[PDB]
Amino acid sequence: VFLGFLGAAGSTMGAASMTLTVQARNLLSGHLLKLTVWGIKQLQARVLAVERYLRDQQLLGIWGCSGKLICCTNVPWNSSWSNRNLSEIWDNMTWLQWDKEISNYTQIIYGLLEESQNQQEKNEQDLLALD
């Protein structure tokens, strides 16, 4: 059941959510001035590939999803973004059709996650403090 890189791009969302490992593992990999022609094209690609990966790992770090892939959070799904069944979201569509559906409601969500974490860590630290 090894599809490959991006191999479930047109598959179901309920089955593309089981192959997240391979797209997570392929986000970083690896007579004088002719070394500098290909070199500055290779060195500018390796540094950009790292700090793009560290951005999506830090942005995932401040939601309570430090070292996970399927991480689930506190904030509920606001139905104004979409009003669909769970069967009409998960086991019939694909992730490319889904990203066009809520492309307007990304930064609304990405601010909802950070505030639910800083509320959470200040309440966790006062729960074990009484300890």
Partner 1 sequence: NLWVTVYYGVPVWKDAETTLFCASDAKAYETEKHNVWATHACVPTDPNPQEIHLENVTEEFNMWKNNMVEQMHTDIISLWDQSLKPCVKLTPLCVTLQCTNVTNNITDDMRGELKNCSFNMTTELRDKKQKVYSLFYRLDVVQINKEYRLINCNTSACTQACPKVSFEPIPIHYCAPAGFAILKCKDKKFNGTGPCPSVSTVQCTHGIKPVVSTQLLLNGSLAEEEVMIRSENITNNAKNILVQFNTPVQINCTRPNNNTRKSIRIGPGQAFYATGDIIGDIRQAHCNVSKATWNETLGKVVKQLRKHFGNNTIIRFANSSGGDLEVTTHSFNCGGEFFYCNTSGLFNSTWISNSNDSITLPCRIKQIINMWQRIGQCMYAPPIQGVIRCVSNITGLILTRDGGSTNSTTETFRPGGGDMRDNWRSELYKYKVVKIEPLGVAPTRCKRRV
Ligand X SMILES: *[C@@H]1O[C@H](CO)[C@@H](O)[C@H](O)[C@H]1NC(C)=O
Q: Please report, as ranges, the residues that interact with its own copies according to CB under 8 A.
A: 18, 20-21, 24-25, 28, 30, 36, 39-40, 43-44, 46-55, 58-59, 61-62, 66-70, 72, 114, 118, 121-122, 125, 128
What gap in Å lies between CA 101 and CA 94, rounded to an integer? 11
- Cβ nearer to ligand X, comparing 29 with 103: 103
Q: How far is the CB of 70 from partner 1 (least distance, A)?
A: 6
What gap in Å lies between CA 30 and CA 22, rounded to an integer? 16
What gap in Å lies between CA 96 and CA 99, rounded to an integer? 5
Q: Quote the tokens at residue 124.
A: 């966790």
Q: How far is the CB of 78 from ligand X (least distance, A)?
A: 4
Query: H-helix or E-strand containing 16?
Result: helix 13-16
List of residues contacting ligand X (CB under 6 A):
11, 78, 80, 104
